Amino acid sequence: MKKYTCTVCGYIYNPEDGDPDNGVNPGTDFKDIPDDWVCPLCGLGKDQFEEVE
Ligand SMILES: [Fe+3]
Structure with a gap:
């Protein structure tokens, strides 16, 4: 899985970390x-997000 950033x-x-405070668990x-x-x-x-490489 790839990081994405807000442009x-x-x-x-970071998919590794998810965003758990907003319902998105680690690994998503x-x-x-x-x-x-x-x-x-x-x-x-x-x-407003794009894939990171
Ligand atoms: Fe942003």
Whole structure:
């Protein structure tokens, strides 16, 4: 699985760590995250994210 980052703010989603405070457990592929989950830092949605390489 790949990290994704928010291209509006730098927030890196790391699949290893999930985002547990918002319901996304460790091991959750970004593409498996609920499409109504927001960047925990800027409060925008998945669509401002891109795959990291
Ligand atoms: Fe963001």
